[PDB]
């Protein structure tokens, strides 16, 4: 008879990840954890993405919101921490576009990235729709991760029926994903404070 | 006794999505559908993602590829309209992520961004990793569309405790989907235009 609480529930799944997968992490398999009923849980986590995001914002109490004094470059060091945790766990990037978490952690790390942005001086509408550009790019990104067909395709294009394609390649496909990850955090910091969001549609 | 071909498996996938869903499209009940077994369609479609991919593949050749000249206004056109098949279809952008479409429409889809994004006369680094950039941003915001807590927890957040996130607030949450992505695409553009592709790590 102990009493069922959210945290007790994200605990059990931390520790039933790290044991047997995270395939293995369902509403089912932890509610046969817990000796109850799917039911019970649903009030403290309505769903697997929810549950992913729980699990996920545990994670990120591992990431460093301290430092590896100025702004850029401390933003590019959390957001490649964060990008670590997503890399290590790519179907919780895949749910996290899902159901971004919700907890304390995920509120931290928005807290801490949205403090550097805010020391380019751009302004504050830009500041705000611009962190979750940062943390969607990089859960993006490792969402493509391995828990191709399409680079064959593009190597394979006739110059004469795709020139464009041909005009592009190698660099089209050339790049590792940290590469990749450098040059977006780069274009996105610098569009972001460019960019004035206009008003409502 | 007819042959089986990858056109012939996919045409089928799209048919079996229309008629029943898309979470009906398994390879199990693919086989089922063709009177075959599993082994015979992973020649042509190696996996779940691969064949989501095929089926975005086949939705793509809706999108106007034409026109709705200069290039940034009919770039953001084309970029349109396949979110917007990507919003139809949400699980086929979170599969996108997982393992892009490759087949005709799509090589046709990146080719015409491609040349479009090319008249701005960036060098051509930045005009094949920006399409990349262009294209994985539909898909990841397309992905989070519904098949929030994030929300709820952002304006609970104390100004004491929090003082970045209600610094942001109500912006910070604020804008429809498509404000949202009318400012990444010329954050990203912007981006992109401006930010050299560095050499190798």
């Known amino acids: 008879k102990p009493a069922l609480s959210r ?3 994200v605990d059990t799944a931390v520790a039933l990840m790290r044991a ?10 932890l509610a046969q954890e817990l000796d109850t ?6 009030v403290y986590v309505a769903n697997t993405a929810e549950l992913h995001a729980a699990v996920l914002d545990a994670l990120l109490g591992e990431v460093d919101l301290t430092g590896a004094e100025d702004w850029r470059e ?3 060091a959390v957001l490649t921490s964060y990008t670590l945790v997503l890399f290590a766990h790519p179907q919780l990037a895949r749910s996290a576009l899902v159901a971004r978490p919700s ?4 509120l931290r790390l928005v807290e801490r990235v949205l403090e550097l942005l805010a020391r380019s001086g751009a302004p504050g509408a830009q500041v705000a729709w611009g962190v979750d550009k940062l943390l969607q790019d ?3 990104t490792a969402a493509e991760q391995a828990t191709s067909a399409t680079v064959r395709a593009l190597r394979d294009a006739d110059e004469a029926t795709h020139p464009a394609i041909a005009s592009h390649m190698p660099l089209l496909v050339a790049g590792s994903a940290h590469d990749r990850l ?7 910091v610098n569009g972001i404070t460019r960019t004035p969001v206009p008003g409502p549609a």
């Open 74 to 76: 401390q933003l590019r």
């Open 138 to 140: 990089a859960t993006a």
């Open 103 to 106: 907890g304390e952690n995920y």
């Open 7 to 9: 945290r007790w529930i």
């Open 37 to 42: 009923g799917p039911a019970s849980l649903y």
């Open 182 to 188: 450098r040059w977006s955090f780069d274009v996105l």
């Open 20 to 29: 047997e997968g995270l395939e293995k992490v369902t509403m089912r398999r």
